[PDB]
Amino acid sequence: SRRSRSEILQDVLSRCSPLNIPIEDDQPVKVSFEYSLQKIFRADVENDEVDIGLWTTLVWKDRCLNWFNEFTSFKELTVPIAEIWTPDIFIFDSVGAPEIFSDKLARVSQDGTVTYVPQLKVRLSCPLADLKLETGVTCSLKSGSWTHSTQELTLEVNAKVDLGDYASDTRFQLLNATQQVNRKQYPCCPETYEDTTLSFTFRKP
Template identity: 30%
Template structure:
């Protein structure tokens, strides 16, 4: 009888203890899942009214085909939208100082977010479609270029898709190679501090038609994906917006200039000579 009583007691205790251990496991999984969804990535729109990249959408290829057909039926990519406010950012992936050219060569991801009201849709009418991935050549895009480029092509970028959302918001993140004039100071060569700039702006649109602002308001380059093999360390990373007026025109032309202050790591110049 005592053995039966003890056995029943153990079973009851285990039954009450189990929910706590299960709860701890669930909390752990939930915390891990939440952390995974907040991990930064090149494709990261700012709007809070939609998921960033939901791969479990209920829409089908038929829904997306019908959506694309309706969106682009009367769409003219040669005509710019009204009052574009572009968020622009630079993710620095790698850079090298070209001392013989007085320049800096950098690999970057450029982040563009803007809104085109002609590309809006009601997701419920298209199977819940919350994002449409399209060839970037199919839509109007801001003609942003690197003003202080040393390359005749200005910016060399890999051809990439754009992501379009029901609100008409467009996200474009092309990876690019840039070569920009640096104006190296050689007074304390090779260890003097150098300030290298990347100056971006529209080539044809004034600020009343295409205004510029920083991606997520961050007045710096994003260095979170930097793999620096240049032999230089980054001392300062700042950016500023300027509205410039030219003699030809009464309207301002905004530009965003990203400034990097760099300094050679001691001993690196010896390895370059070997």
């Protein structure tokens, strides 16, 4: 490949951090979260579980060190997700372990910015009843860091929900996809925790 690029990955991977938040100063890490709802694959009336094929856009900035002076070189490199720390974002009410559709690869930038987009199929609790009716049905699932409080991780969203990718001839039509950010509390801890509640309204076409 390119030798210049080669040095970059090795320096960051070999020299530049183990799993530890590199930021010493006054910063929580914000992670932008967006959902591209690909398809609502299936509904289970007996189980009251619904399946979503989604990919999640995750963006964050990590502190990286510039060592060897940056010359005009390879600006973004791609690396396996395993190589770097990723956020704990989880669906609060998944019925089953989510499965991963896509390769675990993340693009990293010199500024330290990282973009990771997994594709996933998730089963979440939701009653399908009245899917056939014109009114349709509503489901909600909340995503957010399991462990991190708002102080440690701040979640942000650019927009409501990305319908564009949605499969044209999906079994179910999308009434409205929303991603509203909310902060709430748990009995364990005094700290506020932030999650993104994805509320999807859909019916069978």
